[PDB]
Amino acid sequence: RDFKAKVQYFRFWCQQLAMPQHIKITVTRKTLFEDSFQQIMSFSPQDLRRRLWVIFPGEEGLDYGGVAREWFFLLSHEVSNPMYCLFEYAGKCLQINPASYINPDHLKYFRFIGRFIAMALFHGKFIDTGFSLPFYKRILNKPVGLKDLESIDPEFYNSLIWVKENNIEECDLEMYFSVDKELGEIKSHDLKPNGGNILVTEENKEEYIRMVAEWRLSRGVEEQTQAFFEGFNEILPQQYLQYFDAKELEVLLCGMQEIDLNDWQRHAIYRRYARTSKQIMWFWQFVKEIDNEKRMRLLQFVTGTCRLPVGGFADLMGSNGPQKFCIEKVGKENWLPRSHTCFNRLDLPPYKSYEQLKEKLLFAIEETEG
Amino acid sequence: MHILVKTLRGKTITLEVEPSDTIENVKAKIQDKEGIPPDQQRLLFGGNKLEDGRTLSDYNQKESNLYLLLR
């Protein structure tokens, strides 16, 4: 496939659904989030499909021509601010905070964030914020599972992988198709009908691992997600993004970024490998050979995102705080390469040649792991 | 070090334990809070199963997630 062809097709569809003339959006830097909220909601969906003439009155360095790119950039930063109680963030990705009920109008704000993200896609403006890999699959109406749980909760994922790879019937483990749910006291919640009295066995352990992973990834953010998509679909229907994947949609929203190969290799750690290891040297020869379009996909495959901090690869973050890009020696030449986005760790097997690495990695970043 | 003891149902159990404490001693400490026999308990750190007798410093820190599977 070709992402340039898919983006060009999607841009043509938006131009057909676009409306004539324009609308005025007046905001300020001090109260940007609330101004933007009031403004975007004051308009109708058909009005938000017209040209967005945005202004920042009394802001030196901006003019009364178009200022939508600075609005979409700056507003995307303030969306992540935890004071609004909508998203939980790491200091200096967007994960919907399950305690957003604190803000009584949180569902009204999630509809606005839904419209905001659908407006960035429609009008072809980039944002400097992004959601998790599973959340992009939610936008694309793609099925979510155990693979996507590793990014949000690695130790739950690791406990489920033990159940998948080890024999539960021999170990004789008591597990049912049911999970805990609270607000006063706590009560059981079935995963499948009458799940509570259905013991997990070898025949249905894969079904159980799926249904628990699916639950954990959306346990307390259902209404919030439902509110986000009310706002999303009334601007841009999700059907228009069906031919994209979670990695293409991220670049369609956040735009292309030139990755610095020098800053990448300088702030890269190695597990059971050296800087002078035959496979590590073939990896940087591969990164230098591929086009920036594939370098972003390789970065996404290992870290879970094409986006980088303003600092660089030294300030790269994981799930358990700061974690630099790692390349681990794992398996044999017969294996396919794997990744751990929680720790930004690439499991690179010890291949015998460069062409085997180029064929195995280029295929693993395009076809993904399954 | 205060570490969390979780399950696949969603329950959590904050238990205070020193790094010198073993998996047999950690499972025995869970009996005082949950009330499950240590033989029915099956703990695991990371992707690997925890063996009764080995110290917690071998598997390796503060605010960690140990998943418990009942038998």
XYZ file of C-alpha atoms in Angstrom:
441
model
C 0.000 0.000 0.000
C 0.847 3.757 -0.089
C -0.198 6.218 2.689
C 0.266 9.214 0.283
C -2.466 7.703 -1.959
C -4.853 7.068 1.001
C -4.351 10.641 2.391
C -4.947 12.120 -1.128
C -8.209 10.109 -1.448
C -9.486 11.175 2.008
C -8.671 14.873 1.212
C -10.875 14.623 -1.956
C -13.850 13.241 0.072
C -13.655 16.163 2.583
C -13.544 18.774 -0.277
C -16.922 17.353 -1.516
C -18.589 17.518 1.961
C -17.096 21.095 2.533
C -19.411 24.165 2.695
C -19.047 27.674 1.145
C -18.098 31.012 2.795
C -16.537 30.978 6.368
C -17.194 31.316 10.153
C -15.558 33.504 12.839
C -13.769 31.920 15.825
C -12.510 34.390 18.437
C -10.307 33.104 21.264
C -7.604 34.339 23.670
C -4.421 32.614 24.909
C -5.292 33.119 28.640
C -8.712 31.293 28.554
C -8.199 29.364 25.226
C -9.807 26.036 26.307
C -13.054 27.654 27.565
C -13.228 30.276 24.731
C -12.730 27.500 22.140
C -15.368 25.340 23.912
C -17.985 28.180 23.918
C -17.086 29.109 20.308
C -17.019 25.591 18.690
C -20.339 24.683 20.443
C -22.070 27.977 19.457
C -21.875 26.745 15.801
C -23.680 23.895 14.046
C -21.887 20.973 12.320
C -22.633 22.408 8.816
C -21.141 25.788 9.949
C -17.996 24.011 11.282
C -17.564 22.426 7.759
C -17.086 26.039 6.291
C -13.696 27.868 6.313
C -12.408 28.404 9.887
C -11.381 32.061 10.076
C -9.749 32.055 13.568
C -8.478 35.231 15.357
C -6.557 35.936 18.614
C -7.537 39.583 19.274
C -4.852 41.526 21.159
C -2.050 39.022 20.447
C 1.104 40.537 18.915
C 2.623 38.147 16.369
C -0.733 37.083 14.846
C -2.904 38.952 12.281
C -6.561 38.996 11.233
C -5.877 36.628 8.306
C -6.153 32.915 9.037
C -4.699 31.735 12.391
C -6.265 28.190 12.513
C -2.877 26.333 12.460
C -1.737 28.174 15.643
C -5.211 27.599 17.225
C -5.221 23.854 16.418
C -1.590 23.643 17.731
C -2.073 25.607 20.955
C -5.568 24.265 21.777
C -4.309 20.628 21.406
C -1.765 21.335 24.243
C -4.459 22.728 26.587
C -6.743 19.693 25.908
C -4.119 17.504 27.762
C -4.086 19.856 30.867
C -5.282 17.770 33.856
C -7.065 20.752 35.553
C -10.044 20.215 33.173
C -10.325 16.596 34.633
C -10.760 15.029 31.148
C -7.361 13.382 30.420
C -4.604 11.969 32.686
C -1.105 12.947 31.364
C 2.679 12.518 31.935
C 4.643 15.711 32.738
C 6.611 17.764 30.135
C -0.417 10.848 25.286
C -4.182 11.353 25.828
C -5.680 8.685 28.164
C -9.325 9.492 29.126
C -9.371 9.946 32.925
C -12.060 7.648 34.498
C -12.576 10.310 37.251
C -13.845 12.940 34.719
C -17.283 12.906 36.537
C -15.467 15.427 38.928
C -16.188 17.997 36.157
C -20.058 17.866 36.093
C -20.121 18.978 32.372
C -17.276 16.533 31.341
C -19.521 14.817 28.720
C -20.308 18.252 27.175
C -16.512 18.904 27.038
C -15.825 15.430 25.514
C -18.308 16.202 22.692
C -16.334 19.429 22.041
C -13.014 17.452 22.024
C -14.772 15.039 19.608
C -15.658 17.957 17.293
C -12.132 19.433 17.699
C -10.344 16.214 16.615
C -12.844 15.632 13.720
C -12.345 19.302 12.672
C -8.528 18.829 12.550
C -8.981 15.831 10.176
C -11.602 17.532 7.977
C -9.799 20.890 7.576
C -6.359 19.230 7.134
C -4.774 20.971 10.116
C -2.339 19.161 12.414
C -2.505 18.875 16.235
C 0.407 18.427 18.661
C -1.357 15.797 20.768
C -2.290 12.151 20.316
C -4.285 9.289 21.827
C -3.118 5.697 22.511
C -2.788 2.989 19.779
C -6.072 1.279 20.980
C -7.918 4.650 20.979
C -7.040 5.188 17.277
C -8.466 1.642 16.646
C -11.654 2.888 18.441
C -11.885 5.819 15.947
C -11.352 3.343 13.046
C -14.012 0.864 14.493
C -11.275 -1.860 14.523
C -11.351 -4.680 17.126
C -9.271 -4.156 20.319
C -7.535 -6.966 22.291
C -4.593 -8.302 24.379
C -1.974 -6.850 21.961
C -3.179 -3.250 22.687
C -3.318 -3.797 26.505
C 0.551 -3.875 26.721
C 0.680 -0.089 26.003
C -1.857 0.903 28.781
C -1.214 -1.899 31.391
C 1.914 -4.100 30.901
C 1.654 -6.189 34.143
C -2.042 -7.093 33.489
C -0.982 -8.031 29.918
C 1.971 -10.110 31.340
C -0.452 -11.946 33.729
C -2.787 -12.743 30.751
C 0.171 -13.930 28.585
C 1.082 -16.420 31.395
C -2.535 -17.792 31.274
C -2.298 -17.995 27.433
C 1.101 -19.775 27.267
C 0.778 -21.981 30.491
C -1.714 -24.875 31.231
C -4.542 -23.641 33.568
C -6.247 -27.119 33.723
C -3.001 -28.854 34.932
C -2.315 -25.995 37.443
C -6.122 -26.168 38.378
C -6.828 -22.377 38.480
C -10.222 -20.899 39.577
C -11.162 -18.186 36.987
C -14.703 -17.273 35.769
C -16.024 -14.997 32.947
C -16.708 -12.200 35.474
C -15.045 -9.009 36.785
C -15.437 -6.612 39.735
C -17.528 -3.401 39.329
C -18.237 -0.602 41.915
C -20.346 3.203 43.540
C -21.121 1.814 47.054
C -19.472 -1.587 47.919
C -18.385 -3.820 44.925
C -20.436 -6.213 42.712
C -19.656 -8.798 39.993
C -20.099 -7.961 36.260
C -20.344 -10.842 33.744
C -18.207 -10.691 30.545
C -20.452 -13.167 28.615
C -24.090 -14.155 29.571
C -24.006 -16.143 32.884
C -20.190 -15.712 32.833
C -19.884 -15.809 36.633
C -20.736 -19.571 36.699
C -18.597 -20.407 33.543
C -15.117 -21.636 34.570
C -12.231 -20.580 32.277
C -10.804 -23.674 30.487
C -8.264 -24.481 27.730
C -11.060 -24.381 25.074
C -12.196 -20.819 26.017
C -8.976 -19.310 27.615
C -8.404 -17.238 24.401
C -12.032 -15.948 24.558
C -11.508 -15.046 28.271
C -8.150 -13.279 27.614
C -9.916 -11.255 24.841
C -13.014 -10.279 26.878
C -10.885 -9.262 29.966
C -8.425 -7.237 27.814
C -11.410 -5.531 26.074
C -12.946 -4.750 29.511
C -9.723 -3.412 31.096
C -9.114 -1.047 28.098
C -12.605 0.608 28.552
C -13.691 -0.277 32.166
C -14.508 3.295 33.367
C -14.474 5.572 30.276
C -17.580 4.278 28.389
C -19.843 7.374 28.633
C -16.791 9.624 27.937
C -15.895 7.652 24.761
C -19.606 7.642 23.732
C -19.699 11.449 24.223
C -16.445 11.918 22.238
C -17.869 10.001 19.269
C -21.176 12.017 19.392
C -19.050 15.101 18.648
C -16.700 13.296 16.243
C -19.326 11.731 13.898
C -21.452 14.916 13.624
C -18.452 16.695 11.940
C -16.690 13.836 10.105
C -18.407 10.391 9.917
C -16.000 7.567 11.031
C -16.880 5.646 7.757
C -14.563 8.081 5.831
C -11.449 6.734 7.731
C -12.126 2.960 7.174
C -9.101 2.415 4.801
C -6.514 3.725 7.396
C -4.753 1.905 10.267
C -3.932 3.228 13.795
C -0.400 4.242 12.609
C -1.636 6.088 9.430
C -4.429 7.932 11.333
C -1.813 9.232 13.837
C 0.271 10.767 11.010
C -2.985 12.018 9.318
C -3.777 13.912 12.607
C -0.289 14.889 13.865
C 1.379 15.376 10.427
C 4.773 14.192 9.143
C 7.928 14.958 11.216
C 11.586 14.660 10.059
C 13.273 12.182 12.469
C 16.908 13.067 13.425
C 19.009 9.896 12.911
C 21.951 11.395 14.917
C 19.847 12.188 18.029
C 18.246 8.692 17.694
C 21.525 6.710 17.702
C 23.170 8.965 20.394
C 20.334 8.375 22.950
C 19.761 4.616 22.263
C 20.508 1.927 24.932
C 21.246 -1.760 24.090
C 20.078 -4.912 25.980
C 22.425 -7.982 25.506
C 23.919 -6.038 22.497
C 26.767 -3.549 21.879
C 27.031 -0.450 19.647
C 29.550 -2.443 17.510
C 27.250 -5.560 17.238
C 26.789 -6.771 13.599
C 22.945 -6.610 13.982
C 22.916 -3.166 15.676
C 25.104 -1.744 12.848
C 22.785 -3.322 10.191
C 19.768 -1.695 11.985
C 21.208 1.865 11.658
C 22.155 1.090 7.984
C 18.459 0.097 7.505
C 17.170 3.297 9.263
C 19.500 5.412 7.000
C 18.273 3.572 3.835
C 14.475 3.791 4.424
C 12.511 7.024 3.696
C 11.207 9.212 6.575
C 7.696 7.741 5.855
C 9.031 4.279 6.936
C 11.243 5.730 9.767
C 8.077 7.096 11.411
C 6.431 3.635 11.068
C 9.544 1.974 12.630
C 9.487 4.525 15.475
C 5.705 3.897 15.902
C 6.255 0.115 15.888
C 8.795 0.371 18.790
C 7.503 3.350 20.909
C 3.781 3.378 19.976
C 3.950 6.878 18.403
C 5.669 8.898 15.638
C 5.615 12.029 17.887
C 8.783 13.022 19.798
C 9.478 15.419 22.720
C 10.800 18.964 22.053
C 14.023 17.831 23.808
C 14.616 14.691 21.736
C 15.290 10.960 22.235
C 17.023 11.760 25.613
C 13.608 12.901 27.043
C 11.791 9.809 25.586
C 9.050 8.539 27.961
C 7.524 5.096 28.569
C 4.804 3.707 30.885
C 7.016 3.670 34.058
C 8.538 7.158 33.563
C 11.608 7.976 31.399
C 12.795 5.011 29.245
C 15.229 5.449 26.284
C 14.911 3.533 22.942
C 16.206 -0.028 23.552
C 17.204 -2.868 21.162
C 17.199 -6.319 22.888
C 18.751 -9.586 21.625
C 15.827 -12.108 21.712
C 15.221 -15.396 19.822
C 16.927 -16.790 16.683
C 17.162 -16.022 12.882
C 13.858 -17.975 12.319
C 11.859 -15.466 14.502
C 10.056 -12.249 13.399
C 10.940 -8.996 15.358
C 8.662 -7.928 18.273
C 8.277 -4.715 20.392
C 7.309 -3.334 23.870
C 5.832 0.214 23.554
C 5.596 0.486 27.408
C 9.464 0.460 27.608
C 10.237 1.496 23.933
C 12.153 -1.824 23.604
C 12.682 -3.579 20.222
C 13.214 -7.369 20.464
C 15.681 -7.831 17.553
C 16.694 -11.515 16.861
C 20.351 -12.303 15.914
C 20.035 -12.437 12.094
C 22.776 -13.814 9.804
C 22.662 -10.971 7.166
C 21.468 -7.398 6.401
C 18.970 -8.430 3.661
C 17.286 -10.835 6.155
C 16.998 -7.944 8.661
C 15.750 -5.517 5.939
C 13.155 -8.128 4.779
C 12.063 -9.135 8.338
C 11.839 -5.590 9.874
C 10.287 -3.830 6.784
C 7.621 -6.624 6.757
C 7.083 -6.496 10.557
C 6.470 -2.691 10.547
C 4.033 -2.960 7.553
C 2.217 -6.275 8.355
C 2.554 -5.722 12.233
C 2.593 -8.712 14.779
C -0.238 -11.274 15.087
C 8.112 -1.169 50.491
C 4.318 -0.856 49.895
C 3.516 -3.058 46.825
C 0.106 -3.879 45.230
C -1.313 -7.472 44.971
C -3.820 -7.574 42.035
C -6.153 -10.180 40.374
C -7.743 -10.644 36.912
C -11.156 -9.676 38.455
C -9.938 -6.125 39.202
C -9.427 -6.454 43.002
C -6.301 -4.930 44.648
C -4.554 -5.557 48.025
C -1.880 -3.080 49.274
C 0.495 -5.168 51.492
C 3.649 -3.765 53.214
C 6.695 -6.055 52.716
C 10.521 -5.743 52.967
C 12.787 -6.839 50.016
C 14.194 -9.757 52.131
C 10.636 -11.319 52.394
C 10.076 -14.524 50.335
C 7.156 -15.585 48.063
C 6.057 -18.137 50.766
C 6.146 -15.295 53.368
C 4.336 -12.877 50.935
C 1.558 -15.479 50.306
C 1.295 -16.025 54.118
C 0.915 -12.210 54.619
C -2.010 -12.213 52.074
C -3.857 -14.706 54.403
C -4.068 -11.974 57.107
C -5.894 -9.546 54.676
C -7.753 -11.755 52.098
C -8.061 -15.080 53.982
C -6.986 -17.573 51.272
C -4.761 -20.663 51.996
C -1.140 -20.118 50.707
C -1.313 -23.502 48.816
C -4.345 -22.250 46.757
C -2.399 -19.003 46.015
C -0.278 -18.722 42.818
C 1.657 -15.403 42.537
C 3.580 -14.093 39.513
C 5.841 -11.049 38.841
C 6.333 -10.066 35.199
C 5.495 -12.827 32.731
C 7.081 -15.602 34.917
C 5.617 -17.541 37.894
C 6.956 -16.811 41.421
C 8.385 -19.927 43.207
C 7.708 -20.325 46.983
C 10.997 -19.909 48.910
C 12.934 -17.433 46.710
C 13.418 -13.839 48.009
C 11.518 -10.877 46.426
C 14.845 -9.054 45.606
C 15.713 -11.800 43.002
C 12.610 -11.026 40.867
C 12.978 -7.267 41.791
C 10.843 -2.437 43.949
C 8.387 0.065 45.559
C 4.772 0.312 44.180
C 4.902 -2.928 42.058
C 2.048 -5.102 40.713
C 2.046 -8.828 41.652
C -0.858 -10.758 40.090
C -2.507 -13.484 42.218
C -4.242 -16.537 40.659
C -6.397 -18.701 42.987
C -6.575 -22.551 42.843
